[PDB]
Amino acid sequence: STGSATTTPIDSLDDAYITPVQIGTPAQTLNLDFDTGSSDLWVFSSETTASEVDGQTIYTPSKSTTAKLLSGATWSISYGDGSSSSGDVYTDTVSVGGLTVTGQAVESAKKVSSSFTEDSTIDGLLGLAFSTLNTVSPTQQKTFFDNAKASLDSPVFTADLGYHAPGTYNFGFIDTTAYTGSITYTAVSTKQGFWEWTSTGYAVGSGTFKSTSIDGIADTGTTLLYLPATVVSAYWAQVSGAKSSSSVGGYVFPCSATLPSFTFGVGSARIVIPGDYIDFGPISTGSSSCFGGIQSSAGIGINIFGDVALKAAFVVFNGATTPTLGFASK
């Protein structure tokens, strides 16, 4: 089997992407944030504290003839950005782009943090990291991909995120029309439960390539590119007037700037992030200070190849017995 679904930016900045997901019988379609940095499929629901729901579409398990309470199971998650959610668990039928999993754990939120409430466009998350990170207790649950894998034509999914435009998540096949040149594959460590890999270096603009190993995670659920402070300083040094602002929470730059590109290495291959991808707009409405899309990972404890990086590539998440990651230009 295969699946193919369009993923759509939630706003003009590509702050996140939402993908429609069918849950239950009859289908209830919710727009979920596909997150290769976590491993829980959780939704706003009829059980979510009413004051914490503000415009989201909810899953109502009592209206699904295929829903079953997973008795005794609870979940609770906290994300790198400080947001969180928790609740109980149902199993139900879940379909993405025509690919169906029966008995998928659907984690129903009883509580969500303010950041989730305040974002009316995201109805929940669909985790695509390794199932070892799933938070369901006392019986850990499998991700949608893990459940689908054996049925797929090939045990893979691909992320093709657009810049200021829709893109595609495919399951079970590689669309050879969706990228240019060849796909370069690179080793993955699953030891921390992430799609963790090592970039071979970087360049700023038309500058020379610096060969240096940068360990990090491919994370579709993180907006920005978080890299070591040395790398980030080298990038912003090429933008007149750019500075790190403790008050704002990262590098800012004059909105009048033209940003240089940023290149990262994948083996001997190179992925170029155009300068425009690195612009996250005014820090507040009407400001001439703009927020940068490349930020320091210092104090996160891990480098993160978030959407800023991934949307410059066609990315293969290869879930074979020994997982790997593939990157192509597009």
**Residues assigned a catalytic role:** 35, 199
| Three state DSSP letters for the chain | CCEEEEEEECCCCCCCEEEEEEECCCCEEEEEEEECCCCCEEECECCCCHHHCCCCCCECHHHCCCCEEEEEEEEEEECCCCCEEEEEEEEEEEEECCEEEEEEEEEEEEEECHHHHCCCCCCEEEECCCHHHCCCECCCCCCHHHHHHHHCCCCEEEEECCCCCCEEEEECCCCCCCCCCCCEEEECECCCCCCEEEEEEEEECCCCCEEEEEEEEECCCCCCEEECHHHHHHHHCCCCCCEEECCCCEEEEECCCCCCCEEEEECCEEEEECHHHHEEEECCCCCCEEEECEEECCCCCCEEECHHHHCCCEEEEECCCCCEEEEECC
> Cα-Cα-Cα-Cα dihedral of 138, 71, 105, 308, to 10°?
-50
Cα(294)–Cα(263) distance, rounded to whole angstroms?
12
Instruction: Find tokens 């029966």 and name the residue.
Output: 102
Cβ proximity of 131 and 39 under 8 Å:
yes
